[PDB]
Amino acid sequence: SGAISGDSLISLASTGKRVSIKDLLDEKDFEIWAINEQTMKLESAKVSRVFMTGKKLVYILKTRLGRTIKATANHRFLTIDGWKRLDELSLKEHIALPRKSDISWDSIVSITETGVEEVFDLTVPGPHNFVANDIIVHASI
Amino acid sequence: SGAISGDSLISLASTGKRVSIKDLLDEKDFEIWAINEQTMKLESAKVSRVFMTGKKLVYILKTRLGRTIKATANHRFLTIDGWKRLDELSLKEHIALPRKSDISWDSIVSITETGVEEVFDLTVPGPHNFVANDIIVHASI
């Protein structure tokens, strides 16, 4: 149920390349990087499908390291105490970023509403999350 | 225990004038606007003293109306369910702004760390809060 800006760069596990999620709309069955929540280790995982969900108000989330992403109020990020909607995060939270133990829990330094844009998501069977703009984000539903 | 940037403009109840809290450091016993939490009505209240608390990292909080203020991570604002530290606020919260029923509960649209600056507070016996940059904020201790 979330969605992120089409500008967001998706990390491709088999290569180390990044291509915007907008540019991946007509693509499927490629691997992305997901965190396995039970083990807290990153693992390659297949993307079932990519899709746009329409135009939605988006918000810039920025971490102390400088990682940033634009996303809907309801898109979820991985917090020390679980998945939380962007609109539920506060500056006291830390969120999961891929490090290369497998992850860094970085402080949020900014959350600001920016504007409406075309927004996208993807489905990832099993772990249900992926790395975009070098930040761990939840996938479809 | 909070504190806000010296740039913050303090609403003077007897006149309707605004002067930065930095500019009020050597001033006392003037009235400011405070909310009476039991009644939720604004009332004039005396400022006992104004003081700088040193240099501290500050954060810009902005509301949907466009009201904005720079304040420490621990400075409190009035939420629909009580006083909350800036670092505990999320975009789903609304905070109290003086309206002229007596107050408007406006959505937060931005919270972003900005930099270190000299920071100030003031003491207000009884209601313990005041209006700065047209936003209700908690006073000393």
Q: Are A101 and A11 in contact (CB under 8 A)?
A: no
Residue B58, chain A, CB below 8 Å: the answer is no
Tokens representing residue B11 in the block: 């609403």
How many alpha carbons fall within 13 Å on the CB side of residue A57?
9
Asked if A110 and B109 come within 8 Å (Cβ–Cβ), the reply is no
Tokens representing residue B48 in the block: 């006992």
Domains and CATH numbers, chain A: 1-141 (2.170.16.10)
Residue B87, chain A, CB below 8 Å: the answer is yes
Give contacts of A92 with chain B, Cβ < 8 Å: 73, 85, 87-88
Tokens representing residue B136 in the block: 């209700």
Q: Are A58 and A121 in contact (CB under 8 A)?
A: no
Tokens representing residue B7 in the block: 């740039």
Q: Are B137 and B34 in contact (CB under 8 A)?
A: no
Which phi and psi (to 5°) does residue B23 adopt? -70, -10
Asked if A90 and B89 come within 8 Å (Cβ–Cβ), the reply is yes
Q: Which of A59, A92, A109 sits opposite B91 (nearest CB)?
A: A59
Q: Are A84 and A93 in contact (CB under 8 A)?
A: yes
- Rounded Cα gap, residues B36 and B111, in angstroms: 26
Q: Are A87 and A93 in contact (CB under 8 A)?
A: no
Dihedral, CA of residue A60, residue A63, residue A68 and residue A73, to nearest 10: -30
Residue A89's nearest CA partner among A72, A76, A98, A103 is: A76
Which phi and psi (to 5°) does residue A37 adopt? -60, -30
Solved with: X-ray
| Other residues' Cβ atoms within 10 Å of the Cβ of residue A50 | 20
CA B109 to chain centre: 17
DSSP reduced 3-state for A96: strand
Residue B62's nearest CA partner among B117, B106, B108, B25 is: B108
Asked if A86 and B91 come within 8 Å (Cβ–Cβ), the reply is yes
